[PDB]
Structure formats: C-alpha cells, structure tokens
Design a protein around this ligand. Sequence first.
Ligand SMILES: *[C@@H]1O[C@H](CO)[C@@H](O[C@@H]2O[C@H](CO)[C@@H](O[C@@H]3O[C@H](CO)[C@@H](O)[C@H](O[C@H]4O[C@H](CO)[C@@H](O)[C@H](O)[C@@H]4O)[C@@H]3O)[C@H](O)[C@H]2NC(C)=O)[C@H](O)[C@H]1NC(C)=O
Ligand SMILES: *[C@@H]1O[C@H](CO)[C@@H](O[C@@H]2O[C@H](CO)[C@@H](O[C@@H]3O[C@H](CO)[C@@H](O)[C@H](O[C@H]4O[C@H](CO)[C@@H](O)[C@H](O)[C@@H]4O)[C@@H]3O)[C@H](O)[C@H]2NC(C)=O)[C@H](O)[C@H]1NC(C)=O
Ligand SMILES: *[C@@H]1O[C@H](CO)[C@@H](O[C@@H]2O[C@H](CO)[C@@H](O[C@@H]3O[C@H](CO)[C@@H](O)[C@H](O[C@H]4O[C@H](CO)[C@@H](O)[C@H](O)[C@@H]4O)[C@@H]3O)[C@H](O)[C@H]2NC(C)=O)[C@H](O)[C@H]1NC(C)=O
Ligand SMILES: *[C@@H]1O[C@H](CO)[C@@H](O[C@@H]2O[C@H](CO)[C@@H](O[C@@H]3O[C@H](CO)[C@@H](O)[C@H](O[C@H]4O[C@H](CO)[C@@H](O)[C@H](O)[C@@H]4O)[C@@H]3O)[C@H](O)[C@H]2NC(C)=O)[C@H](O)[C@H]1NC(C)=O
Ligand SMILES: COc1ccc2c(c1)C/C(=C\C1CCN(Cc3ccccc3)CC1)C2=O
Ligand SMILES: COc1ccc2c(c1)C/C(=C\C1CCN(Cc3ccccc3)CC1)C2=O
Ligand SMILES: *[C@@H]1O[C@H](CO[C@@H]2O[C@@H](C)[C@@H](O)[C@@H](O)[C@@H]2O)[C@@H](O)[C@H](O)[C@H]1NC(C)=O
Ligand SMILES: *[C@@H]1O[C@H](CO[C@@H]2O[C@@H](C)[C@@H](O)[C@@H](O)[C@@H]2O)[C@@H](O)[C@H](O)[C@H]1NC(C)=O
Lengths: 532, 532
Amino acid sequence: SELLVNTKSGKVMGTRVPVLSSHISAFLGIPFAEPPVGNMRFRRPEPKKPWSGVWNASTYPNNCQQYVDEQFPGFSGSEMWNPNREMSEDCLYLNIWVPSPRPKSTTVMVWIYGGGFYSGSSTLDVYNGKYLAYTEEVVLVSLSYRVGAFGFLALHGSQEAPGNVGLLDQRMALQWVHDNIQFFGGDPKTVTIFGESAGGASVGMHILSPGSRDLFRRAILQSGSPNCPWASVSVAEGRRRAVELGRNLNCNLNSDEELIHCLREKKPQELIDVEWNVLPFDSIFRFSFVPVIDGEFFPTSLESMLNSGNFKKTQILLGVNKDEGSFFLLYGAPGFSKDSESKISREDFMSGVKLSVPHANDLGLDAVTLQYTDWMDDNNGIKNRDGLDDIVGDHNVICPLMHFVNKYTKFGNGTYLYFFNHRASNLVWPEWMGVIHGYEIEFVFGLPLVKELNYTAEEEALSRRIMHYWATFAKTGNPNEPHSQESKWPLFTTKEQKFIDLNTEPMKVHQRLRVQMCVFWNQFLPKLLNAT
Amino acid sequence: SELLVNTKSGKVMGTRVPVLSSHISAFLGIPFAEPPVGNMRFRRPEPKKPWSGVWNASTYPNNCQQYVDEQFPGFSGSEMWNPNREMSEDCLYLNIWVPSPRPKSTTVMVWIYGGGFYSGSSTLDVYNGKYLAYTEEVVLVSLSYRVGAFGFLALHGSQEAPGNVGLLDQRMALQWVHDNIQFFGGDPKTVTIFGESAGGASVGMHILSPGSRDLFRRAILQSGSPNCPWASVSVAEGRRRAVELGRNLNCNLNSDEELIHCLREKKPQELIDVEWNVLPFDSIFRFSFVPVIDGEFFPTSLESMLNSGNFKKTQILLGVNKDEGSFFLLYGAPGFSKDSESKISREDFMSGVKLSVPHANDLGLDAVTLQYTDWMDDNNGIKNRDGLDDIVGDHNVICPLMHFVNKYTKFGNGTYLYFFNHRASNLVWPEWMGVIHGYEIEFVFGLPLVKELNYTAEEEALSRRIMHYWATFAKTGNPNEPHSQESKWPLFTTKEQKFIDLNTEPMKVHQRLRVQMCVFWNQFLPKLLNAT
Ligand SMILES: *[C@@H]1O[C@H](CO)[C@@H](O[C@@H]2O[C@H](CO)[C@@H](O[C@@H]3O[C@H](CO)[C@@H](O)[C@H](O[C@H]4O[C@H](CO)[C@@H](O)[C@H](O)[C@@H]4O)[C@@H]3O)[C@H](O)[C@H]2NC(C)=O)[C@H](O)[C@H]1NC(C)=O
Ligand SMILES: *[C@@H]1O[C@H](CO)[C@@H](O[C@@H]2O[C@H](CO)[C@@H](O[C@@H]3O[C@H](CO)[C@@H](O)[C@H](O[C@H]4O[C@H](CO)[C@@H](O)[C@H](O)[C@@H]4O)[C@@H]3O)[C@H](O)[C@H]2NC(C)=O)[C@H](O)[C@H]1NC(C)=O
Ligand SMILES: *[C@@H]1O[C@H](CO)[C@@H](O[C@@H]2O[C@H](CO)[C@@H](O[C@@H]3O[C@H](CO)[C@@H](O)[C@H](O[C@H]4O[C@H](CO)[C@@H](O)[C@H](O)[C@@H]4O)[C@@H]3O)[C@H](O)[C@H]2NC(C)=O)[C@H](O)[C@H]1NC(C)=O
Ligand SMILES: *[C@@H]1O[C@H](CO)[C@@H](O[C@@H]2O[C@H](CO)[C@@H](O[C@@H]3O[C@H](CO)[C@@H](O)[C@H](O[C@H]4O[C@H](CO)[C@@H](O)[C@H](O)[C@@H]4O)[C@@H]3O)[C@H](O)[C@H]2NC(C)=O)[C@H](O)[C@H]1NC(C)=O
Ligand SMILES: COc1ccc2c(c1)C/C(=C\C1CCN(Cc3ccccc3)CC1)C2=O
Ligand SMILES: COc1ccc2c(c1)C/C(=C\C1CCN(Cc3ccccc3)CC1)C2=O
Ligand SMILES: *[C@@H]1O[C@H](CO[C@@H]2O[C@@H](C)[C@@H](O)[C@@H](O)[C@@H]2O)[C@@H](O)[C@H](O)[C@H]1NC(C)=O
Ligand SMILES: *[C@@H]1O[C@H](CO[C@@H]2O[C@@H](C)[C@@H](O)[C@@H](O)[C@@H]2O)[C@@H](O)[C@H](O)[C@H]1NC(C)=O
C-alpha cells in the first residue's frame, strides 16, 4: 500500500489528504526519540526503540510544553502561533508529506519551527507541508524539539542538564531523516533544512556544529541567524538562569544534582509560570532558555567559528522581512498597542531604546538614539515609532544576519539573499506593524493558493514563485531555473553584495542590505561598548 | 575744513576719496595706542599720547608683523589676504570712512579682521570701507590688532606677557571710537562691531568680556564664534606653547623673565619662522598663539559664561558660509590641491579625519568617520572630498556657531541667523572649494558694485541687499525695513530656530541649521571623548 512504509524503526501507516483538488500522503506523528519524561527531563534525547506492529501515523502529535500567548484571546493573529494540540513532555515526533504517487528519490525539505526557543509547534496551519509537497514535488518534513527550560536549561559540567538538548532533538530528527527518508521516496543526499526566526538560527547552528553538518546538504535561513544576540548565552549565564529558575521554585540550590532533582519533580506548567523571571535585564526580544556556547555542540565562540571558516561549506538561501521589530514592540514596549497607530512620545522612545539594547551603558544608548533620530523632526510620533521598529529589527535580526552572510560567503559555495517586503493584503495585525516577522511563512508554505484564505491573485503568484525558488534551490543549490526566460536572482558575492526584493512587483536587484545601520550595529557600537 | 577733525588725541587730516562716481572722506592710519615696540612687545597696549599738530591721515598705515602666504605666488586668491603694506611692530592704527558731507550723528560700524589670530590686515582691498560708508551712510571704522606671538603669547601670572594683548588692542580701539567717533559724525551709542572668522570670534569675545561690553551696542559675527575649538587655549597650553617657542629659539627657559627677555631681543621674523613648530598635534585649522582663558578678560570658562548668561545682552546678526572647511583642507591636508578636483582616496580620508579632530581617540575617529560616510558608496572620491570639507566646516565653524547661537538667544534681545551659499561667479579658487570661508566678505563690503571686478548684475543686487541688511541692523537692531514690501528675515528664536539663505534666489526660510551634524559635534562626540 502507498500509505504503508517500513522503516528502520518499524512500519508506519499514513493517511491520504486532499490538497488543491488532488491528494497526497501524510505521515503525521512519527516518533524519532524516546519520550523525554521523568528522569529524562533536561537530558539528551535517546533514539526511539524500534517497534513491532504498525505505528498509526494518521494524526498530528502533541506539541511540546510551552508558554501559551493569551494577550488577544480568540484573535487569529496571535492564536495562529499557539499550540493547536494538547501539550505534553512527550513531544519528539515528526511529520512527513509525500507526493502521490510515491517518488523514488526526490528532494527533501526539513522545516524547523521558530518561537524564540520558548515555544513553537510543527502542527500549525501555516506550517502545513502539503501544498509545498504537492506543488513542487518535494518530500516535506517537519520536526519538533523541546523548547523553554525543557529544551535549554543549562548546567554546564553536568550530564543530567547539559544545555542544548533541544538542538540535539533537532539533530536526532535529522539523523532519522538521513537514515529513513529513502523509504518515503526522499533523497537523503539532497536534504535542505529550512527555518524561520529561532528556526533560522537553529539552521545556522547545525551549519556550524560539527556533529550536525554531515546530516544535511544545504540550508535556508528566514529572519534568523545563529549569532542573533538573543539566540545564545554563555555557560555562566545559563548556569545563573537555571539557579534562578530554581530559586523561583524553592529548590535546594547547593548542587547541580539537588537542583536538577528539584526541577524534575515540578509539573511542567510550574516551570513555564516562572520562566520569564530569570532574565537578567528589563528587555525586549530576549528569551530565558536558549542555546549555550558549551565547547561541545559549539566548539568555540560563534564569531571565532565564523571567522576561521569552521562550518559547513555549501549553498545557503536567506533573508529578512522589512519590519522585523514590530511584534516585539507590541508585546514588550510601552506605547505600542494592537488597536492604535501607536505614535510614540520622545519618552516612550527613550524607554524603548533602553529595552531594545539592554547590555548598554548610557553612551551606547545615546549612540543608538542619535543613529535613529531625525533631529529636524524629533517629535514626530510616526517617526519615533518607525525608528524603534527599525532599531529592534536591525539589532536583533537584520544586522546579525547580514554579518552571518558576509562571513559565511567568504568560505561557502553559493549565497542567495532576499528582502521580503510585501505586506499580506489580509493581515489582521495593524498597519503600523508593516511586514511583520513571520508573515513570509504563509507564502513559503503556499497558503495563498487556497481561495478560502482571501489572498489576492498577485499574492498567489508571489507564493508560487517563492515556493519554486525555495524548492529549486533545495534541489540544485540554485533558486533559478537554468534556462528560464524569467529574471534571475543573482548570487550574493563578497564584492558586490547583491540581493533581491521579494514582493508582487517585477524583481529588483540591490546591493548592500542596510549597510549604513549594520556597520553601526556590527562594527561601531560593539567597539564603543568594549572601550567603556 | 571737512577733512580736518579735532579729536581728544589731537587733530587729524584726512583725504577725499572717490567711490562709485562720487566722493567721501577717509581718515587712514590714525594711531590709537603707543607703538608696542622694544620692551613693550607682548605687553598690554598703552593709549596713544596726544599729539600737537596735524596728524597726516591720508595713507594706510603699516600691517602688523605676520606670517605671509607664499604657496601661490602671484595668485590673487591667496594674495588678496596678505599684507599689502610694509609690516611693522608699529601697527596699532585705525581707518575711518565718513560720508560727505559729514553727518552729525550716524550709525558706526567697526570691522575686526580675521586671519586665525596669526595674521590679517585692515588695509586689504576687500575690507575697503568706502562703498559701504557711501551706500548706507554709515561711518565705517577698521581697526587693527597684534597677531601671532606678538598679540597672543601667554605666560599667565606674568605682567610682561599676560596673554590676550591682541584682544586688548581691539578693546582700546573701540575705547577710542567710543571716546572720539562723535567728532567724525558717528554716533557712539550706535556702534555695531562686525568681524569674519577670528574677527567673528573676536566680536563674540567682546560680548562675553566684562571689560569690553560697554564699548559697543550690537554685533555681527561672520563664520566665527568665541567658542570655536581653535580660538582659545587654556593657560597651561599657552604656557607650554610659549616655552616651546623659546626652546625653538635657544632661549633661557628658567623663568618667565629670562624667557620673555630672550623673546624680546629676537627680530620679528625669527619668531614668525618658528611659530608653527609649537602646535601640540598634527592638525589642520589650528593656530599657535590665540586667546587664553585667563580669569581676567574671560572670568570663567566660555561654556559656564554662556550657560549662566554672563555676557552682553543685545541684538546679534550672524551666520556661516556653505563650505567653510575647503581652505584648510587645501593648505593642510594630503590629497587636496588647487588645480585638481581633489578626489580623495579612502586613505587620504582617514588621514584627513585624523588631522581634523586632533584631540581624538580612535573610537572618536571612528564615530566621526561613521557620521560622514555613505557606506553604499564609500569609495566615491567626490563624496570623500565633500565629506571631509563638511567635517572641517562643521567641527570648526558651523557647529560651534550654532551652539553659540542657541545659548546666546535664551538671554539675548534678538538674533538674526544666515547661511550664505552663493559662490561668486568670478572666484579664482577651484570649484571643489565651493562657497569658501571669507568669500561673503566682498558682498558685505560692496565690491560687486564696481563694474571692473566682473561680478554679475545679480551679484550686485545681492551685495546691495546684504549691505542694507547689515547697515539697517547696525542702525536699528533689525536688518529689515519696518514697512518694506520686501520679504522679511525672521527672528531666530529658541523654539523655531529660523534662518535664511543669503544668495541670488528669492529669500527662503528654514529651521535648525545643520542640526543633525551639530548634535553629533555638540552633544554626542564630547560625551564620547569624556567617557574614554
Ligand atoms: C562550488 O564548488 C564548485 C566545485 O568545488 C566550484 O566549481 C569549480 O570552479 C573551479 C574554478 O575555481 C573549477 O576549477 C577549474 O578547473 C578547470 C578544469 O576542470 C581548470 O581549467 C581551471 O583552471 C583554469 O582557470 C583558472 C581560474 O579559476 C586558472 O587559475 C588556471 O590557471 C586555468 O586557466 C580551474 O582550476 C572547478 O573545475 C569547478 N568544479 C566543478 C566540479 O565544477 C564552484 O565555483 C563553487 N561555486 C561557488 C559559487 O563558489
Ligand atoms: C474571508 O473574508 C470574509 C469577508 O470579509 C470573511 O467572512 C467573515 O468572517 C467573519 C467570521 O469571523 C464573520 O463575522 C461574524 O458574523 C456573524 C454572523 O453575522 C456574527 O454573529 C459574528 O459575531 C460574533 O463573533 C464576534 C467576534 O469574533 C463577536 O464580536 C460577536 O459578539 C459575536 O460573538 C461575526 O461578526 C463575517 O460575517 C464573515 N463574512 C462573510 C461574508 O461570510 C472570512 O472570515 C475570510 N476568511 C478567512 C479564512 O479569514
Ligand atoms: C528687547 O527688549 C525689549 C525691552 O526690554 C523688549 O520689549 C519689551 O517687551 C515686553 C514684553 O515681555 C514689554 O512688557 C510689557 O509691558 C506692557 C506695558 O508696557 C505690559 O502691558 C505687558 O504686560 C501684559 O502682557 C504681558 C505679556 O508679556 C503679561 O505678562 C501681562 O500680564 C500683561 O497683560 C508687558 O509687561 C515691554 O514693555 C517691552 N519694552 C519696550 C521698551 O518695548 C523686547 O521684547 C526685546 N526683544 C526681544 C526679541 O527679546
Ligand atoms: C575681468 O575679466 C577680464 C577678462 O577675462 C580680465 O582681463 C584679463 O586679465 C588678464 C590679466 O591677468 C590678462 O591676461 C594677460 O594678458 C597679457 C597680454 O595678452 C599676457 O602677456 C599675460 O601673460 C603674462 O602673465 C601670465 C600670468 O599672470 C603669465 O602666465 C605669462 O608668462 C605672462 O607673464 C596675461 O595672460 C587678459 O589678457 C585680460 N583680458 C582682457 C580682455 O583684458 C580681468 O582681469 C578681469 N578683471 C579683474 C579685476 O579680475
Ligand atoms: C512574557 O511573555 C512575552 C514576553 C515577550 C514577548 C512575548 C511574550 C511575545 C513576544 C513576541 C511575539 C513574537 C512573535 N510571535 C509570533 C511568531 C512566532 C513564531 C514565528 C514568528 C512569529 C508571537 C510573540 C514577546 O516579545
Ligand atoms: C604653516 O602655514 C599654514 C598652515 C595652515 C594653514 C595655512 C598656513 C593657511 C591655512 C588656511 C588658509 C585659511 C584662509 N586664509 C584666507 C582667509 C583669511 C582671512 C579670512 C578669510 C580667509 C588663507 C589661509 C591653513 O590652514
Ligand atoms: C488510526 O487513528 C485514527 C484517529 O486516531 C485518533 O486518535 C487516537 C488516539 C484514537 O483515540 C482514535 O480513536 C482517534 O480517532 C482512527 O480514525 C483510525 O481508525 C486509526 N486506525 C488504526 C488502524 O488504528
Ligand atoms: C600727507 O602725506 C601724503 C602722502 O604721504 C606719503 O607717505 C609719507 C610717509 C611721506 O613720505 C610722503 O612724501 C608720501 O607721499 C602727501 O602726499 C601729502 O602731501 C602729505 N600732506 C602733508 C600736509 O604732510
């Protein structure tokens, strides 16, 4: 049968699913690790013991235990990111969408969800692989990994809570794809890993990590890069955060073993309830339990790895959205709210600045303020709002990514760079948020092809064209068709630094994406904070 | 007789002079102090002992001993600034141009020449008072003062070389005008003092100095302000420079009295020959012997005086030229020369930056470079050239002036601000220098009215209109005619910060002159250099 697949772990039974007036197969909820429950909480994942019988893979699995957004109950804008299945510590599963009839050896795409390393789910409507599987004839995998303290509590030197376990979850699912995707008709030597935000940083981290590099062929990073200032912490900071998490829960803190034992007795929601209490600064775009620079997954500092060419050399496709900061100002910063234009006073600006760059002495806060202030018009509320949106976007997403790109491209085998700036016509978030972090995703997964979801014709065209860029790139290392009549996405090179806009207008090529501001953020400001 | 005037110092005989098809009287070369020669070198000026007989005042006097520019022998562009009479330590004289017939009590204008405090002359063609005297019916005075070490050697604590003697020369000439101008038909209670560059800073300094304030009524400052970073030094720096001057001349340096005695035996040209050797940094727009912050002429720091309102409260008219830095890059900075376009390499830029901000650590040099670099186009040679022109202009002339203006206007009785950006059609300097420091002067003194000098009709109109603004302001405190039909130069106020362009186009009003860059220079950069 088309829906029975025998794998090295055992047989699984999939389900047939309709998609755009046709059908494909889906294998949902396949386990790739042992349940990380009880005394295994905070441990490295272990491989799933093989099973006899047929694993029913007709329904989505559980989402991992995570913070659930309740700021706008019933609002689709926020709820489209929340877990849509029961949450459980038993959550290490993957889903596979396979063209029908089953191919023999086709390009594989593996989606790693974002969520600031504190949340996310493989099961969300906007990550449904079927449209992309069907339209581009790829086998689309989505994995899951532990988030929050379950994935990232870090007591370096201990084997019971080493840190990075959530990245090891991802690595194990990619091992599993390496070892089994052939049986579903995928080609294991053409696995592209793709991710948004923390998913994107996760991608970058598997590019850098020696233990991950062999498991995939090429990589797409959307609005995320492994050096984002939010995506890792030192081992001393990790330690501090885990001790403080235990302090919040009246744990014995005399030893790693006392603390871990204490954290393991707690119900998951007890940990989630106090997770945000351990951040060291009053800040936005900062998350408590994230990857640690441990010497193991990451052998040295990310910057020394990027500088010395200590990473996988391959092709990458990557980019950013125009208004990356908007989400984080909405949720975290005074003066921004969902139902006003959120014009910002000088004083909400200065406060915003200080939340945005939390590691920063006063001279640094002045340097930032100066960089983004139009002093001929310093009390324009639109400008202060847009100004802060840019600061947050640039510091956290755009300039780290631009620094990743420039360092990678000196040793790598082909780089393709984009700037997505089409605001979806049906976006339910307000206008001031612009082209919001995460709203390229729907175009990548093909949702504009579904009439019911109310995108325009031109948006369907943009999505088809983005799906094809992504799938062709996964296939060949190059998003362009060899001898198309269509305009060509050029290669980003060290000297010329080209990139394209992704939007509904005919392709334009530019150079040096936000270079004026990324020199501030990548060169001048760190120099300034080192000398003071 | 119209050309005989009896004054409190004695009788003087002037001369009749033609001007634009008419005639006026000129009294040239009137002494206002004793000759500061021999043992009086470096001393405070003493008042001229009155004389019996008629002082022949038919010819220009001697220029003071100064550095003479020989970079472009025979070139009018540079030679129009050099002494046009014999030089002598005997140089404390003034010149007066008086309408004919002699008025009874008319507005008086007193011109203080620029020259970086190391040079300048009252006798230059472009400072000839006759056109302005004649056209606006003012009595026009030009004074002189000692420059270089003769005017500004400073051994604070000594009475033989106290510092500031050149400013005291100016003060004495203004005493003399106060005491005698009535006899030439001027009104001593309507004396406007006006100056360019160091002349402008000199004006500002008499506004601040308690011993000078009563001697004049109002003030015009052209491209110069008393707080320019080049226009004064501390008493310790003055001292250091004077000792080093003596070191250059094999002087006994064991005491103030040994050193001064030694400097007094030298021929003037010996001092001039080594003056440039005492500057502490490799720098442009820096001059060796300038005003010192002594506690006497200036009772406290200039910034504390400006902040506390410790200055004369009156009306001021003031402004800058578009391309103030060009002259100084030409003479002092690698890559700029008179007969090329002077496109500048990245490396002549960085060198230029370091010459331009000599007091600056590396972080400061980076902050400047960042502020003025278009990183999308960092190797444009036009941009690097123009970029450096702006840095030099802004740091030395425009932003100090803008800081003076804003501080003065909180306590003062009326401010009028301009930006002169007309490039004279007949300018012999190259185009890349643009609207060069000092080239508004000719418009102020009316030289475009003379057919032979080859200005255009529109330039004659601009000059007439500038003469009238300056003379009406001197007369009333306001450059506008009460009920003219012409457009109105508004008042610069604290809140609105208005200013006008001076050029051949119909008047435009703008606000906040170079505010984006002057915040860098007046607020961020000094903060940055204090913290490091
Ligand atoms: C991704 O990697 C692939 C393969 O690693 C890479 O393609 C390679 O390009 C190089 C060019 O640097 C090719 O090397 C050439 O090989 C041919 C014969 O096979 C030689 O004739 C060439 O030498 C001539 O030209 C040289 C200039 O590069 C001169 O130095 C020399 O004196 C000769 O005149 C040259 O050595 C190599 O063959 C391919 N490899 C394959 C399998 O295609 C590709 O460029 C990389 N992509 C990116 C974007 O980096
Ligand atoms: C594509 O576009 C269409 C057209 O704009 C859109 O259809 C609309 O969907 C909403 C459902 O969210 C409908 O609004 C409801 O209408 C009913 C019946 O009149 C009301 O009772 C509802 O009110 C309840 O819910 C509200 C809040 O959610 C409460 O405020 C209130 O108290 C009630 O509880 C509600 O207003 C709207 O009627 C349809 N329009 C049409 C023409 O069908 C559709 O949703 C878009 N498709 C997608 C996938 O977004
Ligand atoms: C330059 O200086 C001159 C003089 O110093 C200055 O003109 C002055 O303006 C002030 C306004 O602040 C005048 O003061 C007024 O005097 C009249 C009567 O003479 C009063 O009626 C006024 O009081 C009324 O209005 C006030 C508002 O300012 C209210 O506070 C009050 O409750 C009353 O309703 C007021 O006291 C002053 O008379 C003139 N002086 C002369 C001689 O003109 C000028 O403004 C200064 N220029 C600049 C640009 O600063
Ligand atoms: C107003 O505009 C006019 C027209 O442009 C201008 O008149 C010109 O002035 C210059 C004087 O500088 C004249 O040039 C000279 O001409 C004579 C005779 O032909 C030459 O011998 C001169 O050459 C000597 O000087 C040169 C350098 O200074 C040397 O390079 C050479 O070896 C010689 O020593 C010199 O070229 C020009 O001829 C006149 N033109 C006219 C039409 O009269 C006038 O100067 C402008 N007015 C003002 C005040 O600027
Ligand atoms: C204590 O709780 C907090 C604190 C801060 C933030 C949040 C919760 C949420 C948040 C920002 C948004 C970021 C975008 N998220 C949607 C999204 C998820 C995954 C990929 C893209 C976008 C929703 C939350 C925050 O910045
Ligand atoms: C060691 O000799 C030096 C060093 C530096 C400079 C100079 C000589 C000259 C100079 C700049 C120009 C500035 C403008 N000066 C013309 C001018 C004088 C008075 C008012 C306006 C313009 C001529 C010299 C300099 O910067
Ligand atoms: C496979 O599972 C399908 C749906 O499973 C759903 O969830 C599980 C946990 C059960 O509780 C089940 O009753 C739910 O509907 C079934 O519809 C399907 O018949 C199953 N097939 C086999 C062979 O087990
Ligand atoms: C006044 O002076 C005029 C010009 O003086 C010139 O310089 C002085 C130092 C003398 O050397 C003189 O010969 C020069 O011409 C004379 O033309 C004028 O006649 C003088 N008048 C009187 C009354 O002395």
